[PDB]
Nucleic acid binder design. Structure first.
Length: 134
RNA sequence: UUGAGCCUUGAUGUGUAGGAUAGGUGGGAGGCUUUGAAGUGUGGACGCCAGUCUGCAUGGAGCCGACCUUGAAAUACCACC
């Protein structure tokens, strides 16, 4: 299945560990080893029911460092995806992007949402491995 | 032993347009390749038997992304599932 590069992408990052917000921003430099400039996509598994139309989260947040206001909306399962800019942006720069997104999701808390909201926040680059933040 | 929760990993998913036994969504267009390649001998899993996956290796270093038909993009690539 996997090959020379794709194995090392999962060997560098410990899958069975949820890193801190100060750790995932700098570790993603090892994953991006492409010719071009990649971008970081954020996967947030919202604790909402996608089969209920009254709990849909829809909105847009302003990225302090651009890519650059982005738009987002969850799928028919519960996980919402949006980018927070390029990978060549500094680690502290992506720190500002990620925290502004997390507050934005909490600024659109559904009224009928019963349960813990996020329970897992994960980010990944274009050639990135599974990296979750606290 | 035999069931279930669950970690890692790996496969699975053809109304119909159709080169795809392509679920939604999604970031980006290079990955791939001599940390030993396309095609094939032959064997296994799966199988709605349509066509994917895949052990060894002669061989021996090439394959392929937006492009095109689609409501959707190409497990070339990854992430959440």
């Amino acid at each position: 299945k996997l090959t020379k590069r794709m194995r090392v992408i999962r060997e560098k990052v410990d899958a069975t560990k949820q890193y801190d917000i100060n750790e995932a921003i700098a570790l993603l430099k090892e994953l991006a080893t492409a010719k071009f400039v990649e971008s970081v996509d954020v996967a947030v598994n919202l604790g909402i029911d996608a089969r209920k139309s009254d709990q849909n989260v829809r909105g847009a947040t302003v990225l302090p460092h651009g890519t650059g206001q982005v738009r987002y909306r969850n799928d028919k399962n519960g996980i919402i995806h949006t980018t927070i800019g390029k990978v060549d942006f500094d680690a502290d720069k992506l720190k500002e992007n990620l925290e502004a997104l997390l507050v934005a999701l909490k600024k659109a808390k559904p009224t009928q949402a019963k349960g813990v909201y996020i329970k897992k926040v994960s980010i990944s680059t274009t050639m990135g491995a599974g990296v979750a933040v606290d």
